[PDB]
Amino acid sequence: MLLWRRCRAWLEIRRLDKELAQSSGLPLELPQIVPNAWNEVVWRLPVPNHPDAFMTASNAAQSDFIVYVNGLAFYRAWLALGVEDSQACPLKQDMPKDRKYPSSAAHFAVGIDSPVPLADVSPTMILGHFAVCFTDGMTRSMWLLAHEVAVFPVLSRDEASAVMLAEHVGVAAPIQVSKLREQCRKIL
Numbered sequence: 001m002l003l004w005r006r007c008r009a010w011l012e013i014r015r016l017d018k019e020l021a022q023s024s025g026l027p028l029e030l031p032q033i034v035p036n037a038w039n040e041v042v043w044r045l046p047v048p049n050h051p052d053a054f055m056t057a058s059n060a061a062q063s064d065f066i067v068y069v070n071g072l073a074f075y076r077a078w079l080a081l082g083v084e085d086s087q088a089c090p091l092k093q094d095m096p097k098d099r100k101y102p103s104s105a106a107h108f109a110v111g112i113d114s115p116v117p118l119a120d121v122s123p124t125m126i127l128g129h130f131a132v133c134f135t136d137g138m139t140r141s142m143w144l145l146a147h148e149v150a151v152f153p154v155l156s157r158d159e160a161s162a163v164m165l166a167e168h169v170g171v172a173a174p175i176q177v178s179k180l181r182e183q184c185r186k187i188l
């Protein structure tokens with residue numbers, strides 16, 4: 001029921017608040033941009049006690065922006081959507097119960113040969129507070145979070161939205177997809 005879910009979500013957010021407080025200003029494991037047998041931005045993501053995951057900005061528009069997000073912070077902002085929204089975030093413990101989760105785990109298993117495209121997310125406002133919502137990529141985000149990936153990239157529609165995401169959940173300034181692609185080519 002509803003009070004049940006609200007109280008659960010409240011307690012998880014409080015947990016996240018503490019964790020973020022403890023780990024404030026400590027170094028996190030970053031995605032690693034890798035050289036690739038294609039013409040795309042690809043990252044190696046370390047996954048604790050698990051084989052590496054690989055993701056790609058292949059399905060991004062040149063106009064999109066990349067934001068590298070603190071997983072815990074991203075998770076907390078997702079919970080801010082509340083519990084009734086169709087995009088409501090399951091508690092981490094229940095994420096593997098999600099219907100598409102096995103299909104996502106399957107995709108993440110392939111590796112560098114078929115990297116998983118990024119999620120497309122947006123900053124929004126819910127009952128007067130900041131939250132994150134999705135255009136796509138909720139399940140793969142759950143996989144990442146349930147597997148405790150510390151930092152991962154996400155896609156945002158435009159500069160201001162990406163700056164807003166980075167402000168609340170980012171570990172770095174946003175960078176435009178077109179400009180990152182260019183730099184990857186000039187360096188990697």
Ligand code: AUC
Binds near residue numbers: 107
């Ligand atoms: N391609 C592709 Au996929 C998830 N989760």
